[PDB]
Amino acid sequence: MVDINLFRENNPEIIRESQRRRFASVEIVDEIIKLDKEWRQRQFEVDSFRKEFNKLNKQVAQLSEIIQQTEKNKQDSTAKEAEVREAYAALKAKLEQVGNLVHDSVPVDKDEANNLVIKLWGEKRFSTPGLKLKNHVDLVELLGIADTKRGAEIAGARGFFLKGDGLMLNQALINFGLTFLKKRGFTGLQPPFFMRKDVMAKCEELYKVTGEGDDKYLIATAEQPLCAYHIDEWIHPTELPLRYAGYSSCFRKEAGLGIFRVHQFEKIEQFCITGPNENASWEMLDEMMKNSEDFYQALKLPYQIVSIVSGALNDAAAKKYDLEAWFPSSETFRELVSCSNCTDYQARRLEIRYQTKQYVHMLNSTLTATERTICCILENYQREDGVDIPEVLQPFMGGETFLPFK
Template sequence: MVIDIKYFRDAKLLEILRASERRRCVDTAPVDRVIAIDDKWRRAQHAYEQAKKNLNDISKQVAACVKNKQTDIATTLGGLKLEIDQVKQTVATLEQELKTIAEMRQQSLRHVGNIVDESVPATADEECNEVLRTFVPQEPEWYKKHPDENAKVNEHGILTPGFSILSHADLLEKIGGVDLKVGGTVAGHRGYYLKGRACQLSMALIQYGMNFLIDRGYEAILPPYFMRKDIMAACAELADFEETLYCIPQIKENEDNSLFLIATSEQPICALHINDVCSAKTLPRLYAGVSTCFRREAGAHGKDLKGIFRIHQFQKVEQLVVTTAQESQSMHEKMIEISQDFYKSLGLPYRVVCIVAGALNKAAAKKYDLEAWFPEYKGFRELVSCSNCTDFQARDLNARYFTTDTSQRTHVHMLNGTLVAIQRCLCCILENYQTPNGIVVPSPLVPYMNGVDFIPFVA
């Protein structure tokens, strides 16, 4: 994933890039490194083209010598042949040098972020994430089915039960929905078995989530769960290889063909468009991806140790949109609206925030998070991330489109957004739909639960 090299070659664009990096609150030294390497590449490119021109000129001399039947043709051709061999060697050397410098430039480009949208707050302080919208159900479904005379409205306007609220981790145990002990023995740290009604509820969320997107024009897609390293590098950030991705070593005869487990279906669905050229008339392309996701969570040591809120293996239904540069901003708004409608339908209180520039990953020009209310936590926690990556991913993938009035090919814009991270949403439902005796099943999920609308405590 890289930004367009033009931002390093044009003075006005370079200032835009530097300003964007400053808004991300990062050092601009990587920008200077790219400029230096690109300058070296351009000089090498000039030398390479000049050497090829010299080779072409000598070849023309040989042709002219033969055509004119010079008297000393043998001597002349011998000298020219020697010169051709020397120039060919120079061309080959310069070609290899050019390739090496290009690879260095590509690696350096990966340390520079996408151009941040002007509407994004320019700070690294996540306390400054801008709250854009909130949703609070007027009469929660749990309250309708199990009235609580001691319930009170909290400072966020959310009706909170009068009884002692349990955490999602405790609630999973009380419905007999998880086995963390054996899960840890079998799969290691953060391993788990999801069982019984909790498993059913998870499957219901997957089916409901997929149908929710399909009904809105999305194409269902089940992608590969592992990817080649070179393809993954086009869809993931450098830091992901150190902190997030699981590697499956595949080394044979000194050749590294290692594979990487996907951290999100966004990655293989983006790769679906590698080297693709499509008509603008076929855009946008809307994908509803469903997959198991695998994350090392190397930077999350000590966080969320209880329950299944933060785990190494989980299921997710994802929105992935491929569109034109002109439509990407409006598609971004549409995608977060779809996620909002999904959580409204489940009756979960939430807020939508615009993430500050300093907390954006390198690919995102702008990102919205949808944070849902967790009663026992007494706060909002992220359930959805929705990012506009513009052409940042498409550039490495060489995914482009053309219009009917021009032959020019332009890189597509790619956007991604969680619809539902199954285990996290399950945790949220458990906390928000708890009663003293069990869990109310949100009405949209009941048809996917074989009619079960209440899960009693068994422990």
């Protein structure tokens, strides 16, 4: 949630302007201003009873009916705390729905057709006139590195096995990503692949897991457990910035026969926590964006950075970039990376603390969804008779250079 102080004392015109930019409710800001003021007034009058009480208890100099005022007082107050219960619950219901303050540099439009292209990199391959550069779907079958039929019979729709060199490629990319980030100051973390309902609730298009205790949800992304990692804690300025390289399998109900659009996949994730103060998070977002650029440059996959339009931003994100990579057979760019500064949105929900009441800023950024990355590698590196192996990944398959059809 955003800071409720942003609605007190154009203090709230900044929340409104942000709501306009999201193409979302602007009247809710007024709903929140009433509900904050009533929550505030009920808290004040509970303070007033604790003040009338002590100023009644220290009225005993009389040396009868004041003790009756004290009887009533303590019954009048004990009711108003459950009105503070009811006011705050109403406030949080609405406050929750407000998106994070959209940063000034974000292109203000409603549809991702108008995402601002900010950077191109790499020379692209195009299908010559005779016959198509093959698509990742045909490449996978030709190379024999997934079993999509069998995985579908075993796991239902969109299920697959990795087989032979698909599994070495997948591990190749994971290990290259993990050492890549380790070099650049990151500490690895593999989370549990499921979370307690009540913890996922603060970080139902996730799979549900029953049960040893609590019903649990399968994580859609390592972002979710690393988010919760550090819940309720303080973090000392001296600890920050924190850089974690998240690694997990991921599970998505919405996978809208190949290996790009699937229910289960592996992901390496950058996740960083900074202090809130001197554009540290904004500096960190550029650092995370450079780390991702370098990795696809290292893989020699062409791409474009787009900045995401304000009406397409999720609630947590003040600002977001995608790196969409070139896919030769369709001659289209496709998302391989998203990179968001969520500032204190999640940190205020999770009580991740930093005279002044401060919170940490949190960011996240895909390095690689490995199955997708592989689809992109396959298309880009294909030949008449098979697919070359990206040179950075050759050591991590010590040291094959080529996977052959058929």
